[PDB]
Design a protein around this ligand. Structure first.
Ligand SMILES: Cc1cccc(-c2nn3c(c2-c2ccnc(Nc4ccc(S(N)(=O)=O)cc4)c2)CC(C)(C)C3)n1
Ligand SMILES: [Zn+2]
Length: 257
């Protein structure tokens, strides 16, 4: 029922999900001059060497690559986090043109897209339980700008024609998400929420400063996806991003000087 258009988009979500107007909603604008360096923050530990990807799928709001999270394989630790967070899935948000598509913004700058690597805190045992906790999930956010191709993304781009419509999925084994990471792990961090329903306030956000570059041909392939299922009127899956929400009583901390 919810989506991104005029009659069911982000400004409507609060009716079904009143937490949409809550105290720690995401995304936010990152004001780089106000974010303070926090020398107590650790380097992030992104340990993806043993990741086991399973499927790629169109869920009618994005496309997502899913991982086996039944043991500590691909894990995020350190940074602002206490304990161990297992990688469950990644997905993207993107625009209809290169000047929009990201959910977080940086001094009001919108990037062409944003990658979300979604991890959950193993102390809660399963992801369903984790989403009910204020420290249940950690989402690693990575901006995409349009320039040179990202070789590590091409394997994803090349299967999107097989999952054009909502409900479609495909085998997507042996995908290495290390190929989506920028050089620097410099980051901003703040407490927030899921950016799609149910908008649960369960996320420690870790947003990398350095964007990755993707080619115009790569992002064009994202824009050929459909929100609709096969047999319904074709409506391009574009502009599947929630706008920046009020920061309220939160501080965004920088890992870097
Ligand atoms: C895959 C899986 C396995 C087992 C349980 C669940 C699950 N169940 N339920 C939920 C979830 C659930 C779990 C994990 N992530 C989400 N959603 C999610 C994740 C990341 C982002 S983003 N854009 O900020 O990165 C936005 C939404 C939802 C939500 C619910 C409480 C209504 C019920 N999901
Ligand atoms: Zn997301």
């Amino acid at each position: 029922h919810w989506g991104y258009g005029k009659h069911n988009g982000p400004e409507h979500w609060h009716k079904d999900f009143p937490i949409a107007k809550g105290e720690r909603q995401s995304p936010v604008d990152i004001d780089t001059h106000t974010a303070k360096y926090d020398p107590s923050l650790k380097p992030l530990s992104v340990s993806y060497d043993q990741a086991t990807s399973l499927r790629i799928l169109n869920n009618g709001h994005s496309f997502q690559v899913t991982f086996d999270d039944s043991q500590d394989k691909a894990v995020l630790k350190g940074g602002p986090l206490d304990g161990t967070y297992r990688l469950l899935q990644f997905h993207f948000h993107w625009g209809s043109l290169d000047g929009q598509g990201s959910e977080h913004t940086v001094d009001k700058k919108k990037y062409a897209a944003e990658l979300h690597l979604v991890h959950w805190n193993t102390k809660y045992g399963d992801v369903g339980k984790a989403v009910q906790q204020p420290d249940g999930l950690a989402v690693l956010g990575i901006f995409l700008k349009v320039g040179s191709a990202k070789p590590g993304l091409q394997k994803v781009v090349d299967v999107l024609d097989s999952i054009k419509t909502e409900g479609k999925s495909a085998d997507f084994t042996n995908f290495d998400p290390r190929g989506l990471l920028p050089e620097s792990l410099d980051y901003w961090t703040y407490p927030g929420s899921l950016t799609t329903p149910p908008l649960a306030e369960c996320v420690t956000w870790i947003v990398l400063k350095e964007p990755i570059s993707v080619s115009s041909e790569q992002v064009v392939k994202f824009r050929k996806l459909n929100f609709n299922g096969e047999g319904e009127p074709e409506e391009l899956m574009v502009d599947n991003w929630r706008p920046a929400q009020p920061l309220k009583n939160r501080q965004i901390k920088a890992s870097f000087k």
